[PDB]
């Protein structure tokens, strides 16, 4: 119930929301059907439209009018945005040459530059170029301010997941808005785009910017705007707020546009009908900027222009139907569209089995336009798993396609030509970022970055301490003129041991054999030095990774590679090695095929054993430093040390061998040497965070050798590829992967073909930021470079997407 017999007289768009059942006047009252009777009358004035005209200049104040052209309007803060242009001979902000804003040029009383977040739905990245002719205001913001060629949204590339990620710096799996549509089994409740449940606070995790602000004594304008409050009124309200007395005036504001998303669904991302929506958004921008200029704030305020996601071409005829794969279609609930999520229709059905469903959706048709996945086998880069609201079964749908349950759903629910929600690395899902203001840089292009990083920066722009979030604070310092956040390297928690030769061959009973016993102070002094770390400057280019947790490990030095060996997990946490451009690939010799050698630096008790691999009929093994890339026949003996060995399914060995035998050399050619750090990852609880010992769900049979869930590699070279990796004087270039350690290759539909046809594709699908790998390992890389930490932070957040050009 709401008693709507109160009035909004003087209360229009009140910031402090009043509790039921007294009527509401805030920008959300329409959505809750709870406005005061006079809300339309007082708060949604429209009389005479949105622009001053020559005859309206210096008029008598008429309180009915939407905006004003009277002499007093500037004081009252309620002129039409074009008032000075029409009545005082001022130019539009867009027609003014842009000039560097070296410092905040704010009215007295302003304790800090305000921040206005101008957010646009479905604003695809390529619109900045392709629609630049029709977008003069926006195009002026872009080129005079700071801009990225695109901004990477989060998966799924929908609205609420993205807008709330912007507001929180969190992955949807952490903030809770994991889709446009959701069921929470604990609440036994549902979240939809329409209706009212979505307004319950319990869906919304983390701390959004407005709450971070308020808790820290910084006032906020409200962020959420009902669809029926026209754009012009939203702008006027923000301008009005900006004129409030110092003690009442908000410091952070948001504008929202339903366009271009709305039209792009109807007409597709490039439908000729798309020009108009883009014209109108630009007109809105021009109004804001004109409004700001009038108020002497256009060189004081920091403006962010940001989209939530892009838009792709998607029509009805391009749907896949689960009914063409599944017999049991009515025993399941599918969340449909540009992503699939599947659960049982009823929890009382004990015959339901995810295993058989996945299998029935796997590589069943030739050009199949989606791929099923247990959520924990989704590429780790999507961080889309650690939430009870995300169904165990997920379908990654091909760009340009839809998945529905049955054909009837598609014709009884072509209507649309555009849609979004696909994998976040997909070009058409990319969105925009422009920062313009005193705190942003002047005429600066920055590289593509992820929207999860904005929360931090908006906190910086406001002088706020950010709530704990998924951004890497400092990785976007290069966007900023001042207010940068200067982070320290995390302190190392565990210092390594440096074991010497402390065990005799005969103390090891691991069931390992190696045909190695074929025997000079020239090459005997040389090898000691190698085992003391003589070649370490070559293979450990950026210093050793720091272990950021309490554990017990050893640094092991070799001719061709260096490792941090875990006595707890009985394998390396990392193996580091440099492959120069000229380096040569050799084979594993016949007499060495099944050779495994005891490491006389590491005790039997802290070693793996060959017997456990013999007994484990499913588990085989691989090596972290590839024997194929040994520098000499004599050095190759080190590749076979038990302390270089890791557990590997024969299905995964196919992948690993091809990467180690073929791809590393290829990269070294193409990049002028590469440095490689490889290792295991354990994430059985799929929270994207390093597992403790007691979280491991699988061991090599009969042993305490834990089985990795994933295998990572970090591949570094010189950004200037004319300089070889080991003699790089400037910025670095990185690409990385986190491969799932799976006992089949069901994921790659072409795995029965040669590795050259499918492996590299899989790696690309599982591209990763170094930062992802840090989360998963508790390591901290790049501890000793000549580079600035902020640059190294940006590097660590870099993702190599393998998409073609924007
Ligand atoms: C991305 O960034 C985020 C932000 O940092 C990272 O997530 C954090 O990770 C922390 C480590 O997992 C985690 O810390 C835990 O907090 C528990 C208390 O949490 C409540 O309070 C916080 C603070 O305000 C709040 O943020 C939480 O909100 C979550 O939960 C509610 C649901 O109730 C949601 O509405 C909300 O969206 C959010 O959900 C998400 O996080 C939870 C984890 O809390 C997930 O489970 C959800 O699926 C969802 O994704 C909470 O309101 C605290 O209880 C934990 O302490 C336990 O574990 C430690 C281990 O150190 C142990 O010492 C303690 O004894 C305790 O264990 C006891 O309970 C256990 C289970 O109940 C049991 O096993 C034991 O036997 C004990 O009885 C823990 O400290 C922090 O909450 C989240 N924060 C957020 C916002 O998500 C995330 O890691 C980053 N991702 C990546 C890849 O880097
Ligand atoms: C800029 C910004 C805007 C914003 O909201 C703008 C907004 N209002 C409505 C309404 N009605 C709406 N819907 C999206 C699709 C249906 C309606 O979206 C939000 C939140 C509040 C969504 C979390 C966060 C940020 C951030 N950061
Ligand atoms: Ca949207
Ligand atoms: Ca984990
Ligand atoms: Cl969804
Ligand atoms: Na085996
Ligand atoms: Na396959
Ligand atoms: Zn949309």
């Amino acid at each position: 119930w709401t008693a709507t017999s109160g009035s909004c007289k003087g209360r229009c768009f009140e910031l402090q929301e009043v509790g039921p059942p007294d009527c509401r006047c805030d920008n959300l009252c329409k959505s809750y059907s709870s406005c005061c009777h006079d809300f339309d009358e007082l708060c949604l004035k429209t009389a005479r439209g949105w622009e001053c005209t020559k005859d309206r200049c210096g008029e008598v104040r008429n309180e009915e009018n939407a905006c004003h052209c009277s002499e007093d309007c500037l004081s009252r803060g309620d002129c039409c945005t074009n008032y000075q242009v029409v009545c005082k001979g001022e130019s539009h902000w867009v027609d003014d040459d842009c000039e560097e804003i070296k410092v905040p040029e704010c009215p007295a009383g302003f304790v800090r530059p305000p921040l206005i977040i101008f957010s646009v739905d479905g604003f695809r990245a390529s619109y900045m170029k392709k629609g630049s002719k029709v977008m003069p205001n926006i195009e002026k913001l872009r080129s005079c301010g700071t801009h990225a060629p695109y901004m990477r949204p989060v998966y799924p590339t929908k609205t609420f997941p993205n807008l709330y990620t912007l507001a929180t710096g969190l992955y949807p799996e952490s903030h809770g808005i994991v889709g446009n549509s959701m069921y929470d089994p604990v609440f036994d409740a549902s979240f939809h785009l329409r209706g009212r449940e979505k307004f319950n606070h319990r869906w919304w995790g983390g701390q959004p910017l407005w709450i971070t602000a308020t808790k820290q004594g910084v006032r906020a304008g409200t962020f959420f705007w009902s669809v029926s409050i026209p754009h012009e009124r939203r702008i006027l309200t923000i301008l009005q707020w900006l004129s409030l007395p110092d003690n009442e005036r908000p410091s952070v504001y948001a504008f929202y546009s339903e366009q271009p998303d709305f039209s792009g669904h109807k007409y597709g991302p490039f439908g000729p009908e798309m020009t108009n929506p883009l014209r109108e958004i630009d007109k809105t921008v021009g109004q804001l900027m004109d409004g700001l200029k009038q108020l002497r704030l256009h060189r004081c305020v920091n403006v962010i222009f940001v989209g939530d996601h892009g838009m792709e071409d998607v029509t009805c005829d391009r749907t896949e139907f689960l009914s063409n794969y599944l017999t049991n279609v009515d025993d399941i609930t599918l969340v449909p569209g540009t992503l699939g999520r599947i659960r049982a229709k009823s929890i009382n059905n004990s015959k339901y089995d995810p295993k058989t469903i996945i299998a029935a959706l796997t590589c069943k048709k030739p050009d199949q336009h989606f791929k099923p996945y247990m959520k924990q086998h989704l590429p780790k880069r999507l961080h889309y798993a650690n939430n009870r609201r995300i169904e165990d079964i997920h379908l990654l749908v091909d760009r340009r396609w839809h998945v529905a349950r049955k054909p009837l759903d598609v014709y009884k629910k072509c209507f649309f030509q555009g849609d979004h929600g696909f994998d976040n690395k997909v070009n058409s899902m990319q969105t925009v970022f422009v920062g313009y203001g005193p705190t942003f840089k002047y005429r600066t292009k920055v590289p593509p970055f992820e929207n999860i990083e904005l929360y931090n920066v908006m906190c910086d722009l406001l002088g706020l301490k950010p709530a704990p979030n998924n951004g890497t604070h400092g990785s976007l310092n290069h966007l900023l003129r001042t207010n940068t956040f200067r982070p320290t390297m995390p302190d190392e928690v565990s210092r390594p041991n440096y074991p010497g030769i402390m065990y005799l061959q005969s103390e090891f009973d691991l069931g390992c054999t190696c045909d190695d016993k074929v025997e000079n102070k020239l090459e005997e002094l040389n090898k000691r030095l190698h085992t003391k770390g003589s070649t370490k400057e070559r293979h450990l280019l950026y210093g050793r990774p720091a272990v950021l947790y309490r554990t017990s490990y050893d640094i092991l030095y070799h001719t061709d590679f260096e490792s941090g060996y875990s006595e707890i997990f009985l394998m390396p946490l990392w193996t580091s090695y440099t492959i120069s451009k000229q380096a040569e690939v050799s084979s594993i010799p016949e007499h060495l095929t099944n050779c495994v050698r005891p490491d006389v630096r590491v005790s039997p008790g802290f070693s793996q054993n060959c017997l456990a691999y013999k007994n484990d009929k499913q588990m085989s093994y691989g090596f972290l430093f590839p024997p194929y890339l040994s520098s000499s026949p004599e050095a190759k003996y080190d590749a076979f040390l038990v302390t270089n060995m890791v557990p590997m399914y024969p299905a995964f060995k196919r992948v690993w061998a091809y990467f180690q035998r073929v791809l590393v050399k290829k990269y070294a050619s193409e990049r002028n040497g590469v440095n490689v750090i490889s290792g295991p990852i354990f994430d059985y609880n799929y929270d994207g965070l390093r597992d403790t010992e007691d979280e491991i769900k699988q061991y090599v049979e009969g042993s305490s050798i834990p089985v990795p869930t994933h295998y990572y590699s970090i591949i570094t070279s010189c950004l200037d590829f004319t300089q070889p990796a080991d003699k790089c004087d400037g910025p670095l270039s990185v690409s990385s992967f986190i491969l799932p350690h799976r006992p089949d290759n069901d994921e790659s539909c072409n795995s029965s073909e040669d590795e050259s046809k499918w492996v590299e594709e899989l790696m690309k699908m599982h591209t990763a930021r170094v930062r992802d790998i840090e989360h998963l390992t508790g390591l901290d890389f790049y501890r000793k470079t000549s580079r600035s930490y902020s640059e190294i932070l940006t590097l660590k957040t870099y993702l190599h997407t393998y998409e073609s050009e924007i």
Side-chain angles (χ1 to χ4, degrees), residues 1-412 414-518 520-806:
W1 178 264
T2 299
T4 67
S5 49
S7 161
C8 287
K9 281 166 187 188
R11 287 174 58 195
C12 282
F13 303 108
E14 52 193 22
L15 300 149
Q16 261 205 325
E17 160 202 358
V18 285
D22 341 307
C23 60
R24 288 175 63 173
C25 302
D26 55 85
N27 54 352
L28 262 183
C29 71
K30 286 283 203 198
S31 274
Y32 281 78
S33 254
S34 71
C35 303
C36 301
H37 63 267
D38 48 19
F39 183 82
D40 277 313
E41 194 203 341
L42 306 168
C43 306
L44 303 185
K45 292 162 185 169
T46 52
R48 311 269 261 135
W50 309 111
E51 302 177 35
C52 294
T53 52
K54 290 143 194 172
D55 51 285
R56 281 200 68 180
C57 294
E59 75 193 334
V60 210
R61 171 167 284 268
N62 186 344
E63 295 296 351
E64 288 183 329
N65 304 334
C67 50
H68 302 275
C69 314
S70 61
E71 200 59 43
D72 67 326
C73 71
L74 282 157
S75 339
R76 298 279 299 265
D78 63 359
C79 311
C80 304
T81 60
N82 78 335
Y83 165 67
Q84 293 200 150
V85 174
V86 171
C87 306
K88 299 279 189 275
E90 268 298 355
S91 56
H92 286 294
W93 172 84
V94 68
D95 300 311
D96 301 333
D97 285 355
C98 74
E99 303 274 337
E100 191 173 6
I101 307 145
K102 290 176 184 147
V103 294
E105 295 173 23
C106 300
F110 275 77
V111 71
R112 79 179 60 74
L115 170 76
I116 298 185
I117 298 167
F118 195 100
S119 77
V120 281
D121 199 347
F123 205 111
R124 166 163 182 166
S126 52
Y127 285 162
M128 292 304 292
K129 186 148 306 175
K130 297 171 77 46
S132 55
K133 251 63 183 162
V134 299
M135 293 188 303
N137 282 284
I138 287 157
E139 182 41 49
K140 188 197 175 184
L141 280 183
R142 192 204 59 106
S143 56
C144 300
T146 300
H147 85 277
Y150 60 93
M151 189 185 65
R152 181 175 315 120
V154 293
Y155 187 78
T157 53
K158 304 291 205 160
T159 300
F160 285 129
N162 281 277
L163 292 178
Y164 200 51
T165 283
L166 297 157
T168 59
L170 292 160
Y171 296 119
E173 80 185 348
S174 298
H175 68 59
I177 311 303
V178 304
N180 267 350
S181 193
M182 297 184 267
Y183 174 69
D184 183 305
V186 170
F187 301 158
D188 172 52
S190 285
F191 175 117
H192 323 268
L193 274 157
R194 290 288 186 175
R196 311 171 50 81
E197 172 69 26
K198 83 172 177 296
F199 294 121
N200 197 312
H201 284 203
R202 61 179 179 182
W203 295 97
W204 311 79
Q207 184 182 82
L209 178 61
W210 54 91
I211 300 302
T212 308
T214 292
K215 285 198 174 226
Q216 290 173 54
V218 172
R219 228 136 29 252
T222 43
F223 276 54
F224 7 41
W225 296 96
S226 295
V227 310
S228 62
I229 296 161
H231 289 195
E232 297 88 356
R233 168 59 53 204
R234 304 183 196 187
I235 299 303
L236 292 173
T237 303
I238 289 163
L239 293 167
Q240 189 57 73
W241 286 331
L242 285 153
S243 308
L244 282 167
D246 300 332
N247 73 297
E248 289 167 48
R249 192 177 54 239
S251 275
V252 60
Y253 303 87
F255 178 84
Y256 179 60
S257 172
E258 296 86 0
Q259 290 285 35
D261 173 80
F262 184 78
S263 292
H265 280 283
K266 299 168 108 299
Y267 310 109
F270 303 109
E273 302 89 348
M274 287 313 290
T275 290
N276 285 352
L278 296 179
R279 278 194 201 278
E280 296 302 276
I281 297 151
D282 195 276
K283 200 187 188 193
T284 311
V285 175
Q287 283 175 347
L288 177 65
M289 297 322 288
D290 276 353
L292 291 179
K293 185 181 161 185
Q294 289 197 160
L295 295 182
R296 292 165 310 104
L297 285 164
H298 68 298
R299 287 176 64 83
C300 165
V301 175
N302 284 309
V303 178
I304 287 174
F305 189 85
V306 68
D308 57 356
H309 52 73
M311 185 69 72
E312 174 75 271
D313 285 296
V314 183
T315 60
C316 302
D317 56 306
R318 292 192 301 267
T319 309
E320 292 260 7
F321 299 95
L322 296 193
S323 61
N324 295 347
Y325 299 78
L326 297 193
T327 58
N328 56 286
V329 141
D330 291 303
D331 292 325
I332 72 165
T333 307
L334 166 80
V335 186
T338 54
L339 55 137
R341 320 200 307 265
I342 297 163
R343 65 186 179 280
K345 175 144 189 159
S346 167
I347 42 133
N348 302 124
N349 185 7
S350 63
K351 259 120 281 155
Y352 176 89
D353 197 8
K355 305 149 98 302
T356 76
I357 289 173
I358 296 284
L361 306 159
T362 306
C363 309
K364 284 301 151 64
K365 300 266 166 58
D367 281 310
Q368 186 177 335
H369 303 278
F370 66 87
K371 188 180 287 315
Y373 276 99
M374 285 306 294
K375 60 187 189 155
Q376 76 268 4
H377 295 150
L378 285 174
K380 300 300 282 180
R381 69 183 160 81
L382 304 164
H383 299 275
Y384 195 68
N386 186 213
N387 203 291
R388 78 202 178 205
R389 300 164 185 180
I390 293 168
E391 284 82 10
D392 292 352
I393 295 163
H394 193 88
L395 316 184
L396 276 186
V397 182
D398 284 349
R399 75 192 72 189
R400 285 172 56 90
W401 284 78
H402 271 159
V403 70
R405 197 166 56 98
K406 289 195 269 178
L408 78 82
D409 295 343
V410 161
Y411 66 83
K412 291 256 264 158
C414 181
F415 284 87
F416 55 76
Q417 292 182 261
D419 209 4
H420 51 90
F422 303 104
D423 182 345
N424 63 334
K425 76 169 178 29
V426 170
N427 265 338
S428 58
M429 294 299 94
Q430 302 313 294
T431 190
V432 299
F433 169 88
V434 167
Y436 174 102
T439 311
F440 286 107
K441 296 181 160 189
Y442 173 72
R443 297 189 173 280
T444 296
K445 174 172 70 206
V446 296
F449 69 84
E450 304 198 324
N451 61 354
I452 56 154
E453 305 295 331
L454 276 185
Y455 172 74
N456 278 337
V457 166
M458 297 184 297
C459 286
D460 295 336
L461 297 193
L462 292 164
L464 296 165
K465 182 189 181 188
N469 72 96
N470 307 124
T472 295
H473 205 167
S475 71
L476 296 185
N477 278 343
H478 60 286
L479 279 55
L480 295 184
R481 179 179 300 266
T482 62
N483 293 0
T484 60
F485 167 91
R486 291 300 167 192
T488 55
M489 293 193 183
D491 291 319
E492 179 164 32
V493 176
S494 296
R495 63 166 192 271
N497 301 295
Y498 295 86
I501 311 176
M502 308 167 58
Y503 301 96
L504 294 172
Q505 177 82 14
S506 56
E507 307 185 53
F508 290 85
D509 183 29
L510 310 176
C512 294
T513 63
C514 181
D515 186 43
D516 64 346
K517 288 173 191 164
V518 190
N520 179 42
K521 288 164 214 162
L522 305 156
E523 295 195 336
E524 274 169 50
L525 180 50
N526 215 56
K527 59 195 294 301
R528 280 169 253 169
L529 298 177
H530 294 323
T531 305
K532 307 294 172 157
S534 80
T535 53
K536 76 174 152 176
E537 337 296 338
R538 200 187 142 66
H539 304 297
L540 206 75
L541 294 183
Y542 322 105
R544 65 173 171 80
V547 174
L548 311 181
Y549 62 98
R550 177 72 262 154
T551 189
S552 183
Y553 80 109
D554 299 314
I555 299 301
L556 307 178
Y557 292 127
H558 323 73
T559 304
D560 300 337
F561 70 100
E562 208 200 306
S563 70
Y565 181 83
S566 175
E567 295 188 332
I568 300 301
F569 283 71
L570 312 172
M571 56 191 74
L573 303 177
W574 56 265
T575 289
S576 190
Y577 67 100
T578 295
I579 306 309
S580 83
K581 187 185 179 155
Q582 302 76 41
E584 192 161 293
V585 171
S586 58
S587 67
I588 305 165
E590 296 175 27
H591 73 285
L592 292 169
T593 314
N594 299 302
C595 155
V596 180
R597 309 170 54 239
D599 195 333
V600 294
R601 296 165 299 187
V602 180
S603 74
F606 288 139
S607 296
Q608 298 177 36
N609 75 96
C610 294
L611 181 52
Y613 289 104
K614 192 172 192 297
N615 294 353
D616 200 318
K617 286 300 183 294
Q618 330 308 317
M619 200 53 70
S620 171
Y621 66 96
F623 296 101
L624 286 179
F625 172 83
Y628 312 116
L629 291 169
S630 71
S631 68
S632 74
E634 206 208 301
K636 195 190 288 294
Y637 285 93
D638 306 348
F640 290 112
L641 286 168
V642 70
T643 49
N644 184 38
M645 173 176 62
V646 290
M648 288 200 178
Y649 287 121
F652 188 78
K653 281 167 66 48
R654 287 184 73 197
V655 181
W656 200 244
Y658 184 82
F659 156 72
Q660 289 194 322
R661 195 183 52 101
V662 184
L663 299 185
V664 177
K665 180 65 227 147
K666 192 170 100 192
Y667 301 141
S669 287
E670 294 168 1
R671 304 172 54 172
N672 195 2
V674 290
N675 176 255
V676 191
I677 302 147
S678 290
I681 279 154
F682 307 81
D683 195 16
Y684 284 95
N685 62 0
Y686 54 85
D687 61 2
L689 302 171
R690 172 199 63 93
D691 287 356
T692 60
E693 175 200 281
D694 60 354
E695 268 154 344
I696 303 311
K697 290 172 71 57
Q698 218 183 312
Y699 292 82
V700 186
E701 188 188 283
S703 69
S704 271
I705 313 162
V707 171
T709 55
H710 295 79
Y711 279 108
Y712 77 86
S713 294
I714 298 164
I715 308 163
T716 319
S717 58
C718 202
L719 185 67
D720 172 21
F721 56 94
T722 67
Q723 300 182 318
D726 57 338
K727 297 178 190 79
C728 179
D729 287 343
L732 301 173
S733 164
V734 73
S735 66
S736 315
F737 60 71
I738 312 164
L739 292 170
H741 184 215
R742 285 179 52 187
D744 54 77
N745 285 295
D746 295 0
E747 196 184 342
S748 324
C749 292
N750 309 329
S751 50
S752 80
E753 281 161 49
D754 188 57
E755 290 86 16
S756 66
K757 310 289 178 185
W758 61 273
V759 174
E760 209 177 347
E761 187 191 318
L762 177 75
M763 280 164 67
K764 292 183 188 199
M765 195 47 37
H766 296 274
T767 190
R769 314 168 308 151
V770 179
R771 196 78 190 100
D772 294 318
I773 289 159
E774 298 184 331
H775 288 325
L776 286 160
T777 52
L779 304 168
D780 192 58
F781 300 97
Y782 302 126
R783 313 271 302 174
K784 321 293 191 173
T785 66
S786 58
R787 317 305 303 170
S788 103
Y789 190 44
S790 275
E791 186 196 294
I792 294 293
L793 290 187
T794 305
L795 187 71
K796 287 180 166 192
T797 70
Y798 174 85
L799 183 73
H800 197 105
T801 60
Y802 300 101
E803 291 287 286
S804 69
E805 264 219 33
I806 288 276

